[PDB]
């Protein structure tokens, strides 16, 4: 558990993949709230971010091609 955008306001996007990799595993599965410790509001804001990298070939759906 650490700090989030609850006080430090930030508009979330999908480009900062380093921020995305903290919440996705190597197989490319979205990490649930019980491990992120995040509010689901920002997680759903990040869930749409995951599909953008998934669809635009920045991230894979299945890690084995």
């Amino acid at each position: 558990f650490c700090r989030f955008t609850a006080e430090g306001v930030q508009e979330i996007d999908y480009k900062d993949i380093a921020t995305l990799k903290n919440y996705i595993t190597e197989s490319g599965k979205i990490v649930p709230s019980r491990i992120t410790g995040t509010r689901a509001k920002y997680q759903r804001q990040l869930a749409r971010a995951i599909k953008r990298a998934r669809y635009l070939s920045l991230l894979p759906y299945t890690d084995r091609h």
């Binding site: 595993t25 190597e26 197989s27």
Partner: protein, 65 residues
């Protein structure tokens, strides 16, 4: 999924295999999905976790120590 562990493993040494699915997507969608029992059984399974949490707050009290 994609393991090397090059030289020193000799068998598998895949704790990640048992941390990605292990039976997850596999053993669950083999057969018998029911479309509605998962909604009810998991709420019942989570209710058993309320009983697992009910143990904790009445614990560490006397217990003949």
């Amino acid at each position: 999924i994609k393991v090397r562990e090059n030289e020193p493993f000799d068998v598998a040494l895949r704790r990640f295999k048992r941390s990605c699915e292990k039976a997850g997507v596999l053993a669950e969608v083999r057969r018998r999905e029911f479309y509605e029992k998962p909604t009810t059984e998991r709420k019942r399974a989570k209710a058993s976790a309320v009983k697992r949490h009910a143990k904790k707050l009445a614990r560490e009290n006397a217990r003949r120590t």
